[model samples]
Each structure stands twice: as C-alpha cells, then as structure tokens.
Target: QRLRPFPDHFLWGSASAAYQIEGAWNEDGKGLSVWDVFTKIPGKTFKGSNGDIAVDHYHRFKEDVALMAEMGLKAYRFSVSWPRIFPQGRGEANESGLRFYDDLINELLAHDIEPVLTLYHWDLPQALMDEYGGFESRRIIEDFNAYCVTLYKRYGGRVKYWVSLNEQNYNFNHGFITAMHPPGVKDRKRFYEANHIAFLANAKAIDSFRRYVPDGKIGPSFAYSPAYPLSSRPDDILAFENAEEFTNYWWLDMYCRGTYPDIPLKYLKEKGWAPTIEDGDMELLAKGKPDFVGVNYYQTITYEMNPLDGVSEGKMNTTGQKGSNQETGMPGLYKTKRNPHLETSNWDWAIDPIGLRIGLRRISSRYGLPLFITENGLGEFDKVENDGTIHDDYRIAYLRAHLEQCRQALNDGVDLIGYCSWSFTDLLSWLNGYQKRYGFVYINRDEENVKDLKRIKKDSFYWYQNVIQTNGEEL
Candidate 1:
C-alpha cells in the first residue's frame, strides 16, 4: 500500500440522532413519531424505558455545542427531527421547529464547528404512518422529498454535508421482521415492500437535493457490518457470500449501482417476497447517485451455512448482558456464529478495528467513492468518580485503535473524507437506555432517574481533544 495521509480538510467529529438525544418529544408543535408510540408498549424497550426526556438535548443543545467546541470538534453530525420540522410530515412548516435548528446551527458555527446534518434518522412522523403506513407506502417518496427540499432551502448553504437516511437495513429488519420498532410486524413481504419504498424515498430526496441544494454533498449512512466466513470450508465461504450479497449488498448496491444483485433478486422472487417497484423507480434511483457513501462501522459478523432442516432464527439480546446473544439466520442461507478469535463487548458487539479498514477499502474498491465514517464507537459502561471526572480509559483505547485503522485505510488508497464517532455525549441508546454510554463527555443521568444532568469530561475527552488538535497525527 502506498503511504498516504488524511486530507488536511478532512472532518473529525461526533454524531447523534434526534429521537435518541432530543427529549422534548411533544414540545412546541412537534408531532409524535413512531418511536413515541412504540416505546409506550409494555416489554418493548429495555426496562420499558422510553425517550420522553432523552438527555434533554432539545433544551440543552447550547451546552452540548459548547462541549463540542471545547473538544475541538471540526464537525458535528446531527439529525433533524422530521416531525419537529413538519408536524404532520408534510404541508405547513413548523416555525418553532425551524427556529430550533437555526439556533443550533448558529451556535455550532459560532464555535467554528461545521454542521453535518442528517435529513432522516428513523423518526417517521406518526401522521404519515397513520395516513399511509409511513415508508411502507409509496406516498412517502414525495413527502420525504418535499420535507428535504424545505430543509435544503432553509439551511443547505450553511450545511455542506447532508445524510439522506441512517441505517435502512437496521430499520427495515427491526421494524418489520424482528418487531422491535414501530409499525412492528413479522412479515417478509412487508419488510421488502417497506424497504423498497424507503429506497425510493431516499432516491427522490437525493434527486431533489441535486436540484435544490446542488452544492451540498449527500448520501445514506449505512450500518455496515462486513461479514466473514466462519471457517475456510467452502460451504462457509458460500454462506458468507450469500449473506454479503443479500444482507449487506442488497441496500448498498441500490444506493451505489441503483440495482439489486441478480442472485438475491432471484432468491427473493422464488420466495415470493420481492419488493414492489413502480414505473420510473429504477430510473430515479440510477440517476440519484450519491456523492459519497456514509458508513456506520460498528463490528463485523461471522456466518456459517444454515441447513434447511435446522433452526432458522436466533434472538438478539437487546438486554445489554454479555454472552447472551443467540445465533440468527435465514433458512438455507447463512447463520451468525460466534467468532472465538475476537473479544466481545458486553452488548455482544465484536471488537474488530481492522473491520473498519476493511469496510472503508471495500466501499472504495466497490464504488470508487470517498467514505465518511458517520458512526463508530464503543458502547460501554463508564465509571464517574466523586470528583466529577469519568475515567474511560477503555473507550480511549477503543477509539485510538479505530483511528489507527482509519490512517491505515488512507494509506491503503481509500479516499477517506471524515470520521464522526457514534456520539459526543452519553445520551440515550435506542434499546439499551442510558447505561450503555458512548460519549467523550459523561452526562450525569441513568435509566430510573435523571440526575442533575451534569456534564463531566471523560478521560477520552481530553485524549480526543489532542488528537483533533493535531489532526489524525496524534492518534
């Protein structure tokens, strides 16, 4: 590999979602989201915890931005609450919602931090869901496009980096197949149909972005957990290939190449579970190519062939307990298996920094597009001392190793653009609640009680401060 360095202007920052961070759920004309309804159900989320008051980032973004500036964050990637902007997901604009973002963007700029905005982060307006089943219906394409146009017209010039969607795969899988999220159902056909509609929505938004906000770069942030064969056996390799083409490439190919892999299409068709695509959908997707690929690299998966007669599904341990994960798979395709070679986190996430380098190289080689690491960080338990300092040496080590992988990927000829860790402050985890922290600054809050909500700088915070101060060289 030729030696290379990250571009001097490459962004270094952190990210957060609206529903995950902003707790003012129904404040100031903000319409309810699917999450607002889903978390209300018994036994849905961890300890039945909801995001009704998730760290109160909506009310305390000024404090958050100050922390970002202090940490020398070059960019701050955050998602806009769709319901907040357009209370019903269409029609009239919500002035209060617009003003909230305006103030947040202004604050970030005041601190010399560029605002990287994500248009949608899985908080679909309940109005849309009730009216037309949200992304499951074709009507969402136009509504999503219009919503994005409003944002572009309002803040496009100020924000140069925009993300169209975050983790389409995760949402579709959890929402339809696993019944872990809103509009929860366990139907393969519904899952594929909803996913297709979402693709159209993304493409339409990108198309509108080109016309309305041509100067800004846009793409979907995919949760890319690259798959590995469980062993050197030929069947295992074949299983890995199937998982890659089906689970990973299905969505990515549509984003980059604007088409599905023929093999997966054939399989879905044989199973009578292919998504419905209408006229002009293909044309729109192909023409709406992204400027770059946004990657959310967390961990890698190892797969082995699951025989037709064997058990076909595994349960996910959203409870955040270590060693509680079960192997999951599709019948006659591939099943996830534990990789004894790598250490696992308490949440059963694989510890593989090199997987990130592999992910960057794969995207670079496959699509020839520069990659933006939109989300990558360890979600672990951090201890805060009585002195109000968090000694998160483990998090520092995790990030340090991942940053090294970023440098290596650059050296290996990958056109890397930026790196944004999963979060800047310990906010709410969608399923795990507040205990599973991923932050540079610790927020004094927990599942059962909201402490004074004090922000204390973790050990990793200063470590990252110097890393950003010197660019990637310090890492």
Candidate 2:
C-alpha cells in the first residue's frame, strides 16, 4: 500500500441541493425564487421543466435520509433555501423555513450523519431581485451578508462544514453573461460588476463565520474543469495558461488570496468591463480568506491558441445532446478543443476521472488549502427493467474510476477531506430536466409526468454502501 489511507473521520457522503430535490416551493411561507420564475418562462428549461414538485424530497426527506442511513454515509451535503429562511431575502427571518431545516438536520443527526450545508445554490429569492435587481446592484452585499449572518448564528455549532456559495462562476456566467439564469442579462460589464459584489458578500459571510464558528470549515464550491493545452507547442501552452487564469483563477484568486490576477483584470479594464471596487473592498476580501477550497470537478477542458479577430462567445446546449455545446472563448485568449483521450456524458460533459486527480493537485499547488471534492458524478440516461430495478452499470464504473483517482490524490498529498457525489437521489438537472440523471438512488418521475416518485436503488447504491462501510477498503 503505497498510498496514505483515508483519514479516520474522512466524510464518505452523497449530496443534494434544496432547489433540485425539495418540492414544497410555496409551502411554509416560502417566497418565490428566481428558479420559480425562470422555469415558468417558455424556452428557458428543458420541456419547460420546473422544480415545483421535484422528487417530493421536501415531504419525504425522512425516507430519503433513512436510505442514506442504511448506506452508512458519513456526511450528507445539502443547501438551505435563502427564501425559505428569509422570504424576502432580508428583513425578519421566516421561522417556518428555519423549522424545516431544523427537522431535516435533526433527522440526519439522529442517523449519525454529518451535515454539509451550502448557503446558496443559485436559487436567489425573487424579492431581492424585484427590489434592486439582485446581484446586479451592490445593495445585495448587505442583504446577502444579513442572510448569511442569520444562518451562521442559527446553526453555528451544528453544521460544521459550510459552503459559502455553491458555484459563483456558474451562477454569474449563466445569470448575467449568458442570460441562462435569473434576472437574465447579457452584458460583460454587468457580469463582472455583479461578481465583484458577490465576492464581497461571500467575504463578509466567511468573515462573520470565523467569529461564529471558529472550529468549523467554510469555503465556496468552484466548478473546476482543469485546462490542458492541445499540444506541446509554446503558443498552445501559453494559451492554456491564459484560459486558466481568465476562467478559473479570476474567482479563486479572490476567494483565497483576496485579489484578482493582473492579466484578466487588465483585459476587463481594456474592454471597459472592469468591476467597480468601493472603499475597503480590498481589505474585506483579504479578511475572508477561506479555510479550504471546495472543488466540483467533472472534466478536463483542452484548449488551443486562437486569433483575437472575429472571436465571440458561442451558445451552450442545456439539453442532453452530444456535441451540443458550441465552442466559445475570448478573442485574444483560447478556445475549447475536444480532448481525444476522454469520453463524454450524454450532456456533452467530458468524462475524465484522472482529471479529478489533476484538479486536486492544481488546487493544492495553487491555493495550499485543504480540498473538498464537493460535487462529482456522471449525468446520463438511466434505464429501469421490468423488475423495477435500475441496472446503472455505467454509473458504477464512472464512480469507481473517480474513486480510484481520489485514492491516488490522497497518495499525492492533496489534503483531501471528503468526496460527496453530485447527488444522493435522482433530481432535476437545472436546465436539462429530469432526463439527465445523476444519483445512486433513482427517483421515478419525469418532466411532464408525476409518477409515484418511488425510490429505486441502483447497482451503485449497494456498491457505494460497501465502499463507505469499509472506508474505501472495498474500493
């Protein structure tokens, strides 16, 4: 055994987000969210899908957690609904919303499972947007920080692992840049500006959290696709570096070092898209340095040099179609090229388990912080047989290969703490609807049909149970 064994307390877990699994959208004084509005718009989501009654986890979480208890999951990562806690995103907090999570947390604790809580998961309360355009205006920083302070004080000691923001890059790009998410806008200047405010919000939350829960861990979950040069040419290597800094480090640098790199910052300034930083912004950012880096690794992106002329960002395929995502990049930087050595999911996400290893290594070398593989899984088409069983062999293979790389990451000394697969049960996949599934336990439902919503264990569920019971020994 050349590799270091997983720590005795390493969190062997599965995860879920409230919007994707919890179905009670309007119950318990819960206010409307951006998703509640966006999914109602035509052509916004697949088959006009919405999470109005997603898998009914809001009603059946006890059953869901019981399944997790049977599997012996050391941790269960889930998000708290902002609007659920504060129906208006600020002002008097909703005790009803807090009561829901209280019951959910109590259930998990009774099963001896650790709770990994995410503060926000792309479901911003519509009340905030209606008041001041949500993240677009700087006012959100105070409101967002207020919401965070409420949660920190409420669940400080109980929820030890906290993710400040689920995926800021995805939310900023989709919401502001691509117009794929809430308050959908398509302007580069607004995108960068909104992101700057978000940094302040996250920094303020983390800073407050340090005072509220000094013994706990806190960070943002970044969706990282490690960039690789297409070839060994000097220009290609430079292109990859440029893409890496612009796409990834732009946010990570601020999260860890409280600063943005010069290259991308200069590019934004030249384009008149630089975010306005107010007085004391730098000090606030520096004060919010995370205790660790949370990575949601799924693939490795290959890049090549591109001419600055006639370059523009292209379209994305929210549908589950291979080769559906169009190539897009900055004019003077790099464009994505298909990796020849890796497979892809039905949704065109590159399948590269070793990339997880490469990503953890990059985070370790770059940030020098402990790493949490917060979200990693395969989203694909699953099938059920006549016996009401799902033979998802492909999912098992995907997870096994990734788990092997995680073991290797431990050997590589990445300070890996835990690996929580993207989900615990089949739930909505944001834009792709329910067809693009990623879970060990399959939920019987579709975009248009409200079936029994039965929980069917796939082959991977038992396999993961053995892995957790043995603490990766079986894997």
lDDT of 1 by residue, 1-475 (tens): 3335567888998999999889999899999999999888988887767789888999999989989999999999999999999999999989999999999999999998989899999899999999988987888999998899999998987888999999999988989998887788899999999999888889889988898888889999998999999999999999999999988899999999999889999999989999877888899888768999999998999999889975565777677789998888887999889998998889999999999999898889988987899999999988878886888888988899999999998888898889999889888888888889998889888886887888888999999999888887777
TM-score of predicted structure 1: 0.98
Computed on alpha carbons, the lDDT of every model, listed in order, comes to 0.90, 0.89
TM-score of each: 0.98, 0.98
Model 2 over residues 1-475: C-alpha lDDT tens digits? 6545677889998999999999899998999999988999999999987899999998898999999999999999999999999998889889988888889989999999999999989999999999999987788888988888887887876889999998899888988888888778999899999899989999988988888889989999998988999999988899899989988999999999999998899988988999998899999999889888989988899998888883467877777778887887777788888888888887778889898999999989988999988899988889999997888888989998999999998888889999999789999988899998999999999898969999999888999999898888777
Relative to the true structure, candidate 2 reaches a TM of: 0.98
Instruction: In candidate 1, list every pair of residues with a backbone clash.
Output: none
Pairs with steric clashes in candidate 2: none
